Each structure stands twice: as structure tokens, then as C-alpha cells.
Design a protein around this ligand. Structure first.
Ligand code: NAP
Ligand code: NXQ
Length: 316
């Protein structure tokens, strides 16, 4: 299938990218170098991942080596929750640009709808363990994101972990200048997201699926949690197609017109995960994978369940 999807800003976005959350700083430079060498053109980043400098080393080296031109890359980062204030957005973007060695981002996302008190700590807590919110309304954060487009720092802006009412709040913003190009959300066979995906696609917003393999390295994993990569039903579909379970899990969102961002620091897996443009899941396979939904979330933002903008109380 086609390698890129057209965004509502007129630019094309590669449907397969490399994730970088949890990629160790001493391994992510080589991971991104390998990824670019084996065909990846989209890297998903974030300031909160604390490894953008090392990602940037890889990008810059492959640009210097002329393995790829800047216009061929699609680099995404995200505004962390402690920078939702109007006066902090530009500097947060600029710090990400400096770390990544870039003079623009292809896409910059509001990482979560929840703003937190600014400061050094990424999760400021009160003495009782609750996250300390910011009063900055997300519409005002959106206006600050729009300024970045108009200053040439980013080509597109979008959102992440927004529920459908929060997307709708942006779309209904008075004086809205740029619609969100993307909503990046958790999506896999155990959290299939039919309702939110349909809503976003109907508005021309492209959906990126994160944790497509179920994030087996997530720090809060428990032994009793479900495991996509070990699910015998998914292994059976993979075996039938002579592919790995990971390859099925990556191809699944692609066939839903989603972008997908599997993470790996393992060279062989980085290459394997990209080899998903040479086979097709049947409609029956797709419906079967969808049937595994259990509304199970890797990323529930649990310290934030009383924040006014916590996204996961709503059904979708
Ligand atoms: N917007 C958000 O709030 C948000 C939240 C979560 C994730 N994300 C983004 O989405 C990306 C992907 O999600 P994720 O990191 O949570 O998890 P994931 O991509 O679902 O899974 C990554 C895990 O799978 C392993 N793996 C990768 N390819 C494999 C293969 N072929 N066979 C077996 N195991 C394989 C990796 O191991 P190795 O690395 O050791 O090879 C790692 O432990 C993130 O890195 C981040 O960029 C965004
Ligand atoms: C549901 S509450 O809304 C929320 C809020 C906020 C957040 C949440 C979840 N996360 C975490 O934890 C985190 C941290 C750190 C890092 F580095 C990373 C991570 O993860 C991945 C992404 O991307 O995020 C939740």
C-alpha cells in the first residue's frame, strides 16, 4: 500500500514510524541510524522521553551522510504537560528543535490534554500525591501551537490522548486557525478505538496508533496483564501469513488508514517491523483482530484521574 497519508495541512506523513519512548539514551542513536538505513522516514519523539538529544545525533548524522534529505524525513515531537502556558510553548518547542538538531518539526502535538504546574518536575505533586494542574485552558494552548506554525517552527500541529469531546472542543474553538492534523492515541487489538477513530477520520484528522505491540516494556507492567505478542490467536494469524506477530500488529492499524509507531532498539526488530508492505490481512482477519478489544490501556495517566481534563472518563 501507499507509504504516506495526506494530512489536512497538505503535507504527506509516512504511515510507519519509529517510536522512542523508553529507548535508552545509549542505544537510541544507533536505533534511529539503523531505522533510517532500513527505510524509516518518520520518527516519533517527545521532550518527556529525555532522549531527544540522542535521537537528534542520529538524524543529523544521516543528513550529513546524505543517506536522506531533510524534506524526506517526518519528525514528530510533543509539548509536555508542564508547558501548556502561552509564554512557555515557544521555548519548549525550541528546546526540542535544538535537541533534535532541526530547524522545524513536521508535526508537533499537545502530548496530553492535561496541563500541569510549570517547573522542573514533569509530574508536580502536592503533598498527597496528586498532580498539580495548570489553569491554562487547552483552547489557549491550541492558540499557542498555531503561533508555532505561523513562525515556521513546525509544519503541522496536532493533539494526543484527546477524547472525542476534547477534539470537538478544538474543532469548535472560536477563531480556530489551524485544525489539528493528527490525534495520536493508544490503539491495538485490546483497545481498538472504533468510536474515536471514526470521529477523527470523519473530521479529516489522521489518527496515529501508539503502543501497537502492547508496550511490553512499559514500566508498570504486571505479570497478569494481557500480552498481544503472546496471544495465540494473533500468533495463528501471523503463522497463516508467514509473518511475525509484531508484523501483523503493525499491519493491522495500517489497514485501518492509521499511522503506526512501533518502538524498538533492537536492530533486527527495527528491520523486521518495517517489512509490512508486502502482505495483506483479509477483511476477516481485520474483523477478527478487532474482536479482541477489551478496553485495556497501557497509558492511563493514573496520577491525573481528577484533573479537569483527564481524557479517559468519557466513553471515547
Ligand atoms: N502520545 C503518547 O502519549 C504516547 C504513549 C505511548 C507511546 N507513544 C509512542 O508510541 C511508541 C510505541 O509505543 P510503546 O513504546 O509504548 O510500545 P510498543 O511499540 O507497543 O512496544 C515496544 C516494545 O516491543 C518490543 N518489540 C518491538 N518490536 C518487536 C518485535 N518485532 N518482536 C518482539 N518485540 C518487539 C520492544 O523491544 P526492544 O525495544 O527491546 O526491541 C519494546 O519492548 C512509543 O515509543 C512512543 O514513541 C506515545
Ligand atoms: C492518564 S493522565 O492524563 C497522564 C498524563 C501524562 C502521562 C500519562 C502516561 N505517561 C507517562 O506516565 C509517561 C511518563 C514519562 C514518559 F517519558 C513517558 C510516559 O508515557 C509515554 C507517553 O508518551 O506519555 C498519563
Amino acid at each position: 500500500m501507499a507509504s504516506r497519508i495526506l494530512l489536512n495541512n497538505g503535507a504527506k506523513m509516512p504511515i510507519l514510524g519509529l517510536g522512542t519512548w523508553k529507548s535508552p539514551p545509549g542505544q537510541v542513536t544507533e536505533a534511529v541510524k539503523v531505522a533510517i538505513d532500513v527505510g524509516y522516514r518518520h520518527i516519533d519523539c517527545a521532550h518527556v522521553y529525555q532522549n531527544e538529544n540522542e535521537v537528534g545525533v542520529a538524524i543529523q548524522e544521516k543528513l550529513r551522510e546524505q543517506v536522506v534529505k531533510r524534506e524526506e524525513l517526518f519528525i514528530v515531537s510533543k509539548l509536555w504537560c508542564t508547558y501548556h502556558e502561552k509564554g512557555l510553548v515557544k521555548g519548549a518547542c525550541q528546546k526540542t528543535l535544538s535537541d533534535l538538531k532541526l530547524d522545524y518539526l513536521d508535526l508537533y502535538l499537545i502530548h496530553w490534554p492535561t496541563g500541569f504546574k510549570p517547573g522542573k518536575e514533569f509530574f508536580p505533586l502536592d503533598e498527597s500525591g496528586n498532580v498539580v494542574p495548570s489553569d491554562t485552558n487547552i483552547l489557549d494552548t491550541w492558540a499557542a501551537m498555531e503561533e508555532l506554525v505561523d513562525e515556521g517552527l513546525v509544519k503541522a500541529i496536532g493533539i494526543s490522548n484527546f477524547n472525542h469531546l476534547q477534539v470537538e472542543m478544538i474543532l469548535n474553538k472560536p477563531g480556530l486557525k489551524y485544525k489539528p492534523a493528527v490525534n495520536q492515541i493508544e490503539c491495538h487489538p485490546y483497545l481498538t478505538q472504533e468510536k474515536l477513530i471514526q470521529y477523527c477520520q470523519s473530521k479529516g484528522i489522521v489518527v496515529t496508533a501508539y503502543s501497537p505491540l502492547g508496550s511490553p516494556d512499559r514500566p508498570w507492567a504486571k505479570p497478569e496483564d494481557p500480552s498481544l505478542l503472546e496471544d495465540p490467536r494473533i500468533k495463528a494469524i501471523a503463522a497463516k501469513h508467514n509473518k511475525t506477530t509484531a508484523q501483523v500488529l503493525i499491519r493491522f492499524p495500517m489497514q485501518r488508514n492509521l499511522v503506526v509507531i512501533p518502538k524498538s532498539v533492537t536492530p533486527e526488530r527495527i528491520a523486521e517491523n518495517f517489512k509490512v508492505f508486502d502482505f495483506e490481512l483479509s477483511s476477516q482477519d481485520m474483523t477478527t483482530l478487532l474482536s479482541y478489544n477489551r478496553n485495556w490501556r497501557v497509558c492511563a495517566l493514573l496520577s491525573c484521574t481528577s484533573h479537569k481534563d483527564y481524557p479517559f472518563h468519557e466513553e471515547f
